[PDB]
Design an enzyme around this catalytic site. Structure first.
Site, mmCIF file in Angstrom:
data_model
loop_
_atom_site.group_PDB
_atom_site.id
_atom_site.type_symbol
_atom_site.label_atom_id
_atom_site.label_comp_id
_atom_site.label_asym_id
_atom_site.label_seq_id
_atom_site.Cartn_x
_atom_site.Cartn_y
_atom_site.Cartn_z
ATOM 1 N N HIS A 44 53.491 51.802 29.571
ATOM 2 C CA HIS A 44 52.782 50.878 30.477
ATOM 3 C C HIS A 44 51.501 50.317 29.850
ATOM 4 C CE1 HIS A 44 55.253 51.854 34.118
ATOM 5 N NE2 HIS A 44 55.318 52.982 33.489
ATOM 6 N N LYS A 56 41.948 45.415 43.220
ATOM 7 C CA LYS A 56 42.427 45.991 41.964
ATOM 8 C C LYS A 56 41.565 47.224 41.742
ATOM 9 C CE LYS A 56 44.469 42.713 39.155
ATOM 10 N NZ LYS A 56 45.876 42.560 38.792
ATOM 11 N N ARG A 57 41.806 48.136 40.801
ATOM 12 C CA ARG A 57 40.943 49.314 40.682
ATOM 13 C C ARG A 57 39.598 48.815 40.233
ATOM 14 N NH1 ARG A 57 45.023 50.258 38.175
ATOM 15 N NH2 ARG A 57 45.357 48.980 36.320
ATOM 16 N N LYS A 71 38.592 44.587 34.842
ATOM 17 C CA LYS A 71 39.218 43.909 35.974
ATOM 18 C C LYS A 71 38.392 42.720 36.402
ATOM 19 C CE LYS A 71 42.743 46.538 36.712
ATOM 20 N NZ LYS A 71 44.125 46.194 36.492
ATOM 21 N N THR A 129 51.600 43.883 39.318
ATOM 22 C CA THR A 129 52.587 43.810 40.374
ATOM 23 C C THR A 129 51.980 43.340 41.673
ATOM 24 O OG1 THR A 129 52.210 46.201 40.423
ATOM 25 C CG2 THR A 129 54.135 45.303 39.231
ATOM 26 N N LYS A 185 53.248 40.352 44.436
ATOM 27 C CA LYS A 185 53.200 40.580 45.879
ATOM 28 C C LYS A 185 52.539 39.383 46.561
ATOM 29 C CE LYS A 185 51.863 45.221 45.979
ATOM 30 N NZ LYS A 185 51.799 46.449 45.213
HETATM 31 C C1 PDP Z 1 50.526 46.551 44.535
HETATM 32 C C2 PDP Z 1 49.852 47.762 44.537
HETATM 33 C C3 PDP Z 1 49.291 48.224 43.364
HETATM 34 C C4 PDP Z 1 49.751 47.698 41.990
HETATM 35 O O1 PDP Z 1 49.162 46.446 41.590
HETATM 36 P P1 PDP Z 1 48.119 46.216 40.566
HETATM 37 O O2 PDP Z 1 48.150 44.635 40.405
HETATM 38 O O3 PDP Z 1 46.653 46.401 41.191
HETATM 39 O O4 PDP Z 1 48.278 46.755 39.190
HETATM 40 P P2 PDP Z 1 47.241 47.667 38.638
HETATM 41 O O5 PDP Z 1 45.821 47.312 38.870
HETATM 42 O O6 PDP Z 1 47.468 47.395 37.073
HETATM 43 O O7 PDP Z 1 47.533 49.113 38.759
HETATM 44 C C5 PDP Z 1 48.320 49.178 43.407
HETATM 45 N N1 PDP Z 1 47.894 49.680 44.593
HETATM 46 C C6 PDP Z 1 48.450 49.252 45.749
HETATM 47 C C7 PDP Z 1 47.893 49.744 47.049
HETATM 48 C C8 PDP Z 1 49.444 48.317 45.733
HETATM 49 O O8 PDP Z 1 50.085 48.001 46.905
#
Ligand code: PDP
Ligand code: AMP
Ligand code: AMP
Ligand code: PDP
Lengths: 801, 801
Positions: A342, A533-534, A539, A641, A645
């Protein structure tokens, strides 16, 4: 027995027996009253009523696998971000309306009831979510798959914002237990840590080990309406001073992470061989025993290197326990394992120090070594005289600390290694693992990620799925590429008006939720600009911050000049003890305390931090988003991802040519995407020459002003020097190049509002995006896994009842 | 709501439905199959089927009590020896026959499944069995009673005799979960320990305390066919280094017994005041705030001194929390609590170091001190000048260690104290508590213990219950005085023949168990001689041992004299840490190794030490017993309910005129009893002259031969000196006069065997014991408490259905 079967017990998905069963469960399962029930009691009752329907199907499914002996797929992962099971079970099983009427008629509102459900605290992110969308698509594609992991009792924290700062609170989701799971005490297995290997004329013996017991919990996972209910099995650690060893034991729910890594492996693999050998219908005996068909009947998908101890373990079981000869054991291990990477970042890989594998698991270190040697000999034959190739390729890294490189192991032990995105899998072949690609190109693959169209559209956005379905039917929910049909309505004034309507309803609904929970009043006619996002510096929530102070400062400078109104909602969790992440959440809230309280802003701008972003809340915010902010530095994002969405749900994207954005924009056509800033080729050129942020400061007044507010307490008058830390970093230690992408970001942003001003053309670009998102379904990712890696054929066939 | 009802969900008590619900439970509740079900599953699926019938009736009973607001009775005990819920629930609910036929039409064996249930490990022995027989009689008599205790995670050991010696294996009964209990996480209360006390303006404050959490578990307890199902609530301990603290909070399941007693007091009383205030049907709010009605609405039965802290705790809650003034708060407490003293000995009663209480419960000690100060003032006014009575009656004992005497606490603070047998209740007034009877004589009452005619008869002896039924109806089962009607059949040959038939068939079946679970082969025509008492010195299994060796030695000497064959069975658990008791269990098995393998003995005398004696074993051996060994030293036995078990089931008693044997001989007529040995007066005479064991030995030849055999390694060849410790005890430090009753004991045995030769006269003496046993029903005892201590009139009326 014989006269004991599922035979016709669930009855019907009919509202009269569905109300009987709700009462049967309130009174006999929860031993409760109408006089003493509370919302939770009422939720457990509805949960247990849907659960009988799900369980009847689970049982007819599992049976059916033993009768037909399919190749079984074990998807092994260290987090699964499941979310809330009830509506997803009801949607997936076509029970959501009879339950809605049944509940109405007993005087309850299933909306209020569904919200007492806690999110299964079984994952923290993208990895875990992928694994969860994969479990839905494997069941909807009729594969016999299993998701195995650890049952975290208190998952990673629940976030609470206090004084605009982050607090972590225990995620005590199992407080009143979990109706969806069945604990299996009768199948606790034992795991061995520590010990020493005495050898004998007969084999290696791992003696004098401490044992932890791994107890199984089962939870079904419904395929969408195909009557297939598959299995998630999560392991709980139990202890068999001893006080202290017992606590350390239970901690599996540093060295603790290598423990839980071995725990899920050791335990899962005992089940995989247990069910292998006991192959026949009715018969609980070992019946099979020649492991030659074992590759033909078992697939182990390693989700990331976190379960790579499955490869030394499966060799150890087959070679020591089953006494097979090593070359055959390995024949069977590579033909069985596969690895999913990943990351774009070499530095990020998992390297466990050998001094620790020496202590925690002597035998596996022995097998990592006979793997390594026999590997390097093959590379040696193939590239004779290339000594540094032996060096680079070695599973054992060296010098300073002596380390095992788990990715190198996973590539040695697997027959397929895949990245998650076109460019990303190229990076694996070309720079990350190039020597493994020169030695054995055939194993490298790309399986682009996907998201599940059930949870991410028909569940969370019933309205959108409802207007799509009346035009192209419902066959798209299991075949998302049919969404390309909607291009036939990019000019239909009725579909345009409807697509727009669905989004305004969804925004009104979300505004209602924030109003009753966090008590904010946001204007539902504004553009909902969402960044979730985290919270992390690559980010670049900080670029988004510099932009909202550009907007605030702009409304302020000309308070009677028209602006499209926006509500900027940023949400996400900060790692406890990541100081800069912690400072960024506090800036978002500081900015917002000024902005939202200024009356010259009127209702034209509001900056709102969405607390405790989790799967439940993503399901609320994404159907209400008008803009997806996907602004991380080019080259840092492998996928995205959440991105997909938002595109599935009718938001437009502003982002960098990176991760998921690149295949989304070739699908959507880049003219329907707000791509901005530096591409990857540009950040590297800037790296070849050194980024000096003072050049941006010097030639951009609006940015110079924003940093001037940040250094003087504009956004923290009560404590002026609070944000000095982010200011110095942006100015002098900014690896993610925020100043280098500002001018462009604001210019792209102006284009966003310009388009938003003309509602028919925004809605028409939103139709062009929804109609081309069909590629990003996880059913497409799982049919590619099924076929290219696991060697099984996805079925869209219904199982009986 | 309102449509949300219990309204007919249970359905019919018929075989078709019972089978639907069984299939439904094995499938949806347990998530299993005919393909993977074990016995243990088919038992949980029948327990779950029956339990639905139990819970419906429980809901309508507890609603019935909120709707009628009666005086609720709380029987506080630390141990509830419940045994096994399944057949007791089927019997009490009349489900038994339908559950047998249903299980047959599903091809299962209900008796095999009944033998899977574990004995609920919540009682050590006697006192907890009394607690369990009373739960049943309060329910059968319609009293709104609750049994409140602790929920032990692993009960006290399951005894294991390895090679004649005894093993304490883990009684880890809870492994697979108990289907009868429902955990209530939502109702977890705090319990505080440690702390300090401030005396503020407004009152006193117990501050900075360690908090432990009491989480309750609820089990239904059903009355015999009257439709009243009542609650058993046991508290479980959860901790909120907290490894240490967590372990020790979980260790409640020295200071740990006081923590453990305070735990079950605190939690229970929180509920008592709760359910008082929250009196109105349908309304959960505290309606009732006026404590004047408390003694007419709550009764608390302090079983032994183990919950004595209910008195300082109620005071703390009313004076400190509810803010009543001391004088009124006392007035209320004393009127609510009652003590039941179960001893006869002055040094079995609880005393706690005041150092331990000031540290662990500083507030409670302050209250125990002001109670004593006022008590010692009441006695000073009544006995002016009597300074040594103030010394004597004080709850605080002085001398090296200052101790609190909890039985003085219980007398001072309870409105009624009673003993469990007429002699013992007199003894409490004459010796132990004379000063207290002198001050407030009205408190002292007697309530003779009793057993329950359901378990101990219609349940464990269906044949005896059948033949009594067909001559005098089914009424005896809850009006056991009706058994005197059986005296009309003392001369009826067909009754005499069916009574001896029932015993024979009962012996015949128990013989089958001691094969199919113990390999020794017992002869169904020998008199089954049973002594199952806790292995202890005052109990005198040693006398019985001296008489089994005497029979051996007699047979060996004249192998052609006719002897009546005897099977001697001795059972009981020896406390870990009591050497002499573990030597007695090793002596029993030694004599058995000899006797059972001597060919001149032939099948004329067999000794079996019944291992892990518990209620389900008792339920099997008492129905097949011919002679009941009740031989402890006169003066050591306060009551003895096991005695009553034997009388109801057709055994005759050889016993001392002590404990339950006095009132039994009195109801049955001394002639129908084998009373031997000394009386209380004789042993006190013997103590004033001096017991000199030697005198007996010198004048008794056969005794001399026996002690010779034990010293000579005769019954222990390989270790000759094995039994010399109990020999020196018998011979030189015998505190319970074995040798003093040896010859009258052996004399009486000849009378039992002689009579045993004439079957028509033995069965007539047995009809005379059984018909007189009616007094010893616990229904009688509870009707006495309800009427004379708690102020309630029993209701034998059925509740609806
Ligand atoms: C969709 C999802 C995710 C995963 O999406 P991310 O775009 O944020 O990818 P990362 O930042 O790379 O991990 C994470 N958390 C929740 C709640 C969610 O529905
Ligand atoms: N040998 C077997 N034959 C048929 N069904 C089985 C067998 N083993 C297990 N099952 C089914 O599979 C479910 C889960 O079993 P397992 O995969 O063994 O954990 C069971 O509830 C049954 O439905
Ligand atoms: N105020 C109330 N009115 C009527 N029924 C109640 C009330 N409180 C509790 N119950 C009933 O009594 C049972 C035990 O409740 P409690 O006594 O509160 O532990 C519940 O399951 C209900 O059936
Ligand atoms: C019957 C019973 C008992 C009660 O036996 P005891 O009456 O002899 O005890 P004491 O009351 O102290 O005399 C204890 N334990 C079990 C298994 C049982 O069923």
């Amino acid at each position: 027995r014989k006269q004991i079967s599922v035979r016709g017990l669930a009855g019907v998905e009919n509202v009269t027996e569905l109300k009987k069963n709700f009462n049967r469960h309130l009174h006999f399962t929860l031993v409760k009253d109408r006089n003493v029930a509370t919302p939770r009691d009422y939720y457990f009752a509805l949960a247990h009523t849907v659960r009988d329907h799900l369980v009847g199907r689970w049982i007819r499914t599992q049976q059916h696998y033993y009768e037909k002996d399919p190749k079984r797929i074990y998807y092994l992962s260290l987090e699964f971000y499941m979310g809330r099971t009830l509506q997803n079970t009801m949607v997936n099983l076509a029970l959501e309306n009879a339950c809605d009427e049944a509940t109405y008629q007993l005087g309850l509102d299933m909306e209020e009831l569904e919200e007492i459900e806690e999110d299964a605290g079984l994952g923290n992110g993208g990895l875990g979510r992928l694994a969860a969308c994969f479990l839905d698509s494997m069941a909807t594609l009729g594969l016999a798959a299993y998701g195995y992991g650890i049952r975290y009792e208190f998952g990673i924290f629940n976030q609470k914002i206090c004084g605009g700062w982050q607090m972590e609170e225990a995620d005590d989701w199992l407080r009143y237990g979990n109706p969806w799971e069945k604990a299996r005490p009768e199948f606790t297995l034992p795991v061995h840590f520590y010990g020493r290997v005495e050898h004998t004329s007969q084999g290696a013996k791992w003696v004098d080990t401490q044992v932890v017991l791994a107890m199984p919990y089962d939870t079904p996972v419904p395929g969408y309406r195909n009557n297939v209910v598959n299995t998630m099995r999560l392991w709980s650690a139990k202890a068999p001073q001893a006080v202290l060893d017992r606590n350390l034991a239970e901690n599996i729910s540093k060295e603790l992470r290598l423990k839980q890594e071995y725990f899920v492996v050791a335990a899962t693999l005992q089940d995989i061989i247990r069910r292998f050998k006991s192959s026949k219908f009715g018969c609980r005996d070992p019946v099979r025993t020649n492991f030659d068909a074992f590759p033909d009947k078992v697939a182990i998908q390693l989700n990331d290197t976190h379960p790579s101890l499955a490869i030394p373990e499966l060799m150890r079981v087959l070679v020591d326990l089953e006494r097979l000869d090593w070359d055959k054991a390995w024949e069977v291990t590579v033909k069985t394992c596969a690895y999913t990477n990943h990351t774009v970042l070499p530095e990020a890989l998992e390297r466990w120090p050998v001094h620790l594998l020496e202590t925690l698991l002597p035998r596996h270190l022995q097998i990592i070594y006979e793997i390594n040697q026999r590997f390097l000999n093959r590379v040696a034959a193939a590239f004779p005289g290339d000594v540094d190739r032996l060096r680079r390729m070695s599973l054992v890294e060296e010098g300073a600390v002596k380390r095992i490189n788990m990715a190198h192991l996973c590539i040695a032990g697997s027959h397929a290694v895949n990245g998650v995105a076109r460019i990303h899998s190229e990076i694996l072949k070309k720079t990350i693992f190039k020597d493994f690609y020169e030695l054995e190109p055939h194993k490298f693959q790309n399986k682009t990620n996907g998201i599940t169209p059930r949870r991410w559209l028909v569940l969370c956005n019933p309205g959108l799925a409802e207007i799509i379905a009346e035009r192209i039917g419902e066959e798209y929910i299991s075949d998302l590429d049919q969404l390309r049909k909607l291009l036939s309505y990019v000019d239909d004034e009725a579909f345009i008006r409807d697509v727009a309507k669905v989004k305004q309803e969804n925004k009104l609904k979300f505004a209602a939720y924030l109003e009753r929970e966090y008590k904010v009043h946001i204007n539902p006619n504004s553009l909902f600009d969402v960044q979730v996002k985290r919270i992390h510096e690559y980010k670049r929530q900080l670029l988004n911050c510099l932009h909202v102070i550009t907007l605030y400062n702009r409304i302020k400078k000309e308070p009677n000049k028209f602006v499209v109104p926006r509500t900027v909602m940023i949400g996400g969790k900060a790692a406890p003890g990541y100081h800069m992440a912690k400072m960024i959440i506090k800036l978002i809230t500081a900015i917002g305390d000024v902005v939202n309280h200024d009356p010259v802003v009127g209702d034209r701008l509001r900056v709102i931090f969405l607390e405790n972003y989790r799967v439940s809340l993503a399901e609320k915010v994404i159907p209400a988003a008008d803009l997806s902010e996907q602004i991380s530095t080019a080259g840092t994002e492998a996928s995205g991802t959440g991105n997909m969405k938002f595109m599935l749900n009718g938001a437009l994207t502003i982002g960098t040519m990176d991760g998921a954005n690149v295949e989304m924009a070739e699908e959507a056509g880049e003219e329907n995407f707000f791509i901005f800033g530096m591409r990857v080729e540009d950040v590297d050129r800037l790296d070849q020459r050194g980024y000096n942020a003072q050049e941006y400061y010097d030639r951009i007044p609006e940015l110079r002003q924003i940093i001037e507010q940040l250094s003087s307490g504009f956004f923290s008058p009560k404590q002026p020097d609070l944000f000095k830390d982010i200011v110095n970093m942006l100015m002098h230690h900014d690896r993610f190049k925020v100043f280098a992408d500002y001018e462009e970001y604001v210019k792209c942003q102006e284009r966003v509002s310009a388009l938003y001003k003309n509602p028919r053309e925004w809605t028409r670009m939103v139709i062009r995006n929804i109609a081309t998102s069909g590629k990003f379904s996880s059913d497409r990712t799982i049919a590619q896994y099924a076929r290219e890696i696991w060697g099984v054929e996805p079925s869209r066939q219904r199982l009986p009842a």
